[PDB]
Amino acid sequence: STLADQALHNNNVGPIIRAGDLVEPVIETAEIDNPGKEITVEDRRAYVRIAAEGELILTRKTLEEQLGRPFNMQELEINLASFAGQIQADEDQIRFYFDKTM
């Protein structure tokens, strides 16, 4: 009599963040840090966009920290452009998750 649909699971995350520099060798190193042997990036120039599976975990917070040692974490949450899923940063790490309900 009634139907419904659901999509509570990982699919594809589209993290969008401003661009700067050294994001090429940084993204490559930030990609190897994670077993993302099946992801695609979309760096135009002004901004940096990615397309991961959904459940990823980055620990290259150091490489991202060095990019601007003379700063804070507020810059991170500031360097935001757009998103698709969720994300959770740790002491010195950044994990991305597409899953809605957690």
* CA dist., res. 42 & res. 40, Å (int): 7
Residue 32 in contact with residue 67, Cβ under 8 Å? no
* CA dist., res. 94 & res. 43, Å (int): 19
| Plot region of 22 (φ>0 → left; ψ -120 to 50 → alpha; else → beta) | left
According to CATH, the topology of domain 1-102 is: Phenol Hydroxylase P2 Protein (3.90.56)
Q: Which of 47, 43, 51, 46 is nearest to 84 (CA)?
A: 51
Domain extents in the chain: 1-102
Q: Which of 8, 18, 23, 4 is nearest to 82 (CA)?
A: 18
List gaps in the chain by the residue before each (C–N > 2.5 Å): none
Residues near 34 by beta carbon (within 8 Å), at least 6 away in sequence: 56, 57, 58
* CA dist., res. 44 & res. 89, Å (int): 25
Report the DSSP beta bridge partners of residue 48. Answer: 17, 43
Listing DSSP states for 59-93 in one string gives -THHHHHHTTSSS-SHHHHHS--B-SSEEEEETTE
